[PDB]
């Protein structure tokens, strides 16, 4: 069969690295047409929903252990922030054909035996009876579950205990002095004000609630608009209707309320923020139905249970949340220590997310734009509730570990009190018994309650050829999925052991593979590997230089933040966060910077200072920020086209946007590119821009930060990518 072939390469002959590879699809999934009931591209799972680190699965353990490649699945149930965008097919007859033993769902890989009266489960080989219902002008082959690898069903009654819940929100806002002064409260209020209609309300049942918190927990009774402020203070930190209300029936009142709040705490001098108590308050406020507690704060919890200093209460809270289907999201914006490392556990184990805004300050107009844009997109994001996810494997395969934000204790089931749209997840697979078939399969199932009072079950079925050829296993390895695998193992290692241990784990992942390939597969002295794993060494090396794993000094909050982001980022954004897209703008092609409303972007250059001409203009996009680097020797014409002036020392410095320079088509093109890199319908990230000038203190600090993004270069005591490869070669030698 067309088993993907091994394409040997010499890593030393490919420098700079062919970074265009970061954008190629993974190796093909060699499945002949006969194995699929209705052959088509939709008959096997798309890499967008699931990506196996191995697209040619080792037929047995000893071979898996010998490959030294990991077996993991990058799973992402949703592709966009809004469900109306490119949804999978949706079944509605309520018929759900499932195996009696394993419980796997009918899929494109089952085999109909005995005149099509029964089907043999492809996961456990059990013979099952085909319901007469599967044939009621279309036949069973016109059905999605048989035509598509990724499809969805409307769940029957037995898949529900209680009636689908409404999308419930509880904004727990920090109204302490730090919040007032910084403008976080103002910005938070104004944003809610400007997006009440952005919040999902597909069934008109969406419910909201607002808790303002300082040293006491301030509540608000919101009457129905039709029957036209009641602030109920509670200072006893040891201690529903009209508190959690209809966004629709109280639209004007919620608006009236949010408008007054800023004035209420306008002159607050209290510096207390009792997160613990408030959190328990919100818990009881929505626990009877479940929902999201969205915390906005710029002040370290310092009063009541759960206070922190420069705690396990939170972990216990997440355990309780898993009992009442509550998710917690956090927006931490402050110049002071916030202990993202501790607070991020709230979101982490409740399927929520934490967003960190270092040095946030209203005094900086650009700080407002970033916080607002993200907070707005985040609250507008669709999501599920009471969801659970699991992956079933065919005989011999077993899910062993689960990574990402959700709740999982001693099962193979991942609980999502609410399932967001902007995250990714990873499952490690183990091959126990030897596989006997030429194919093995993996099926991910999501039993969910959509934010439209509907019960659904989303299925993702993946089929992979088995092989005994170690060479074939390597030729079908998904480098980006693998990078992601080790990225999660590294986060675990760090978060539970040490940063250094995590570095050791990252570098080892590369050495073992390079060592294995060299000895397990048959010139001068090259560093051998295959084409599909060509970017792996570079990705792991670059990972060791990421702010999340770097050696040396990195502020506590930044670090925790970076770790939290790398662990939940969608593959696409993960690879870019590790290795950045760098654009050479001064010698930009004429197409670039202009429409094809989507703008065309220049081709990315390698992430190295070797290419930064002193007279050039470069734009760096690392998924977190955008750096506009202008060479200290830029010709006045260039400095002009971009900022209006001809003096390069007069340019804007730091966190600032590019000015609108009239009659400069070049300035428009630069603005187009930036705006293009800023729009995503799958994540909420708004990337602030930092303008840096090439070669008073701030300028040095920025050059330093921007420079650190060029992960191919040497930094302090971390070698360059070139040297890294040399080191590895020396290590796998005798």
């Amino acid at each position: 069969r067309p088993m993907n072939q091994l394409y040997p390469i010499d890593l030393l002959t490919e420098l700079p690295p062919p970074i265009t590879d970061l954008t190629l699809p993974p190796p093909p999934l060699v499945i002949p047409p006969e194995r699929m009931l209705v052959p088509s591209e939709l008959s096997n799972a798309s890499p967008d929903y699931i990506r196996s680190t191995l697209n040619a699965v080792p037929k047995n353990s000893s071979l898996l252990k010998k490959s030294k490649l990991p077996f993991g699945l990058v799973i992402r149930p949703y592709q966009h922030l809004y469900d109306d965008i490119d949804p999978p097919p949706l079944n509605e007859d309520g018929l759900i054909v499932r195996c009696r033993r394993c419980r796997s769902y009918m899929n494109p890989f089952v085999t109909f035996i005995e005149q099509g009266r029964r089907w043999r489960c492809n996961f456990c080989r059990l013979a099952n009876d085909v319901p007469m219902q599967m044939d009621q002008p279309k036949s069973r082959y016109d059905r999605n579950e048989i035509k598509c690898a990724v499809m969805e069903y409307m769940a029957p009654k037995e898949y529900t205990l209680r009636q689908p819940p409404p999308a419930t929100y509880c904004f727990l806002i920090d109204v302490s002095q730090s919040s007032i002064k910084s403008g976080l409260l103002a910005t938070t209020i104004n944003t809610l004000l400007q997006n009440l209609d952005s919040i999902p309300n597909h069934d008109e049942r969406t419910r909201i609630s607002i808790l303002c918190v300082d040293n006491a927990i301030h509540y608000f009774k919101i009457p129905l608009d039709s029957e036209n402020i009641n602030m109920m203070d509670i200072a006893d930190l040891e201690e529903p209707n009209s508190m959690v209300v209809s966004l629709k029936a109280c639209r004007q009142n919620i608006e009236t309320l949010l408008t007054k709040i800023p004035q209420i705490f306008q002159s607050n001098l209290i510096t207390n923020f009792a997160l613990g108590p408030a959190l328990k308050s919100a818990y009881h406020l929505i626990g009877g139905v479940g929902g999201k507690i969205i915390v906005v704060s710029g002040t370290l919890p310092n009063l009541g249970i759960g206070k922190l200093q420069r705690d396990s209460f939170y972990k216990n809270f997440t355990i309780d949340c898993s009992k009442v289907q509550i998710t917690v999201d956090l927006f931490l914006a402050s110049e002071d220590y916030m202990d993202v490392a501790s607070l991020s556990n709230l979101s982490r184990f409740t399927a929520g997310q934490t967003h960190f805004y270092p040095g946030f300050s209203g005094k900086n107009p650009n700080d407002i734009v970033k916080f607002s844009t993200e907070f707005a997109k985040h609250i507008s994001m669709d999501f599920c509730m009471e969801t659970v996810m699991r992956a079933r494997g065919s005989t011999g395969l077993r899910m062993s570990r689960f990574y990402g934000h959700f709740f999982n204790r001693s099962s193979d089931l991942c609980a999502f009190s609410t399932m967001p749209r902007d995250q990714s997840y990873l499952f490690e697979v183990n091959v126990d018994e030897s596989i006997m078939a030429d194919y093995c399969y993996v099926q991910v199932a999501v039993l969910l309650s959509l934010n439209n009072s509907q019960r659904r079950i989303r299925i993702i079925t993946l089929a992979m050829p088995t092989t005994e050829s170690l060479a074939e296993v390597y030729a079908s390895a998904d480098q980006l999925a693998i990078a992601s695998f080790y990225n999660s193992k590294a986060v675990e290692k760090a978060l539970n052991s040490s940063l250094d241990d995590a570095r050791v784990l990252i570098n080892k992942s590369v050495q073992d593979i390079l060592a294995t390939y060299k000895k397990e597969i048959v010139g001068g002295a090259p560093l051998r590997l295959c084409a599909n794993l060509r970017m792996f060494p570079l990705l792991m090396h670059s990972l060791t230089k990421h702010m999340a794993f770097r050696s040396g000094i990195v502020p506590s909050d930044h670090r925790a933040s970076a770790l939290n982001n790398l662990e939940s980022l969608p593959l696409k954004y993960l690879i870019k966060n590790i290795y950045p897209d760098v654009y050479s703008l001064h010698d930009m092609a004429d197409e670039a910077g202009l429409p094809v409303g989507t703008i065309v972007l220049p081709q990315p250059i390698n992430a190295t200072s070797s290419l930064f001409e002193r007279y050039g203009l470069y734009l760096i996009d690392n998924g977190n920020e955008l750096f506009l680097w202008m060479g200290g020797d830029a010709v006045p014409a260039l400095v002009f086209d971009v900022f209006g002036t001809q003096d390069i020392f007069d340019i804007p410095i730091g966190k600032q946007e590019i000015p609108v320079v009239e009659n400069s088509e070049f300035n428009q093109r630069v603005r187009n590119i930036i705006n293009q890199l800023r729009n995503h319908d799958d994540v909420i990230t708004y990337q602030s821009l930092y303008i840096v000038r090439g070669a008073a203190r701030e300028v040095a600090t920025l050059r330093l930060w921007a420079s650190s993004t060029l992960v191919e270069d040497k930094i302090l005591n971390n070698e360059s990518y070139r040297e890294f490869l040399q080191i590895m070669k020396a290590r796998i030698s005798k």
Binding site: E335, P358, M547, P555, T701
Partner: peptide, 10 residues
């Protein structure tokens, strides 16, 4: 921890 958008800020 004094936070700054730039992690390299003194």
């Amino acid at each position: 921890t004094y936070n700054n958008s730039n992690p390299f800020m003194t």
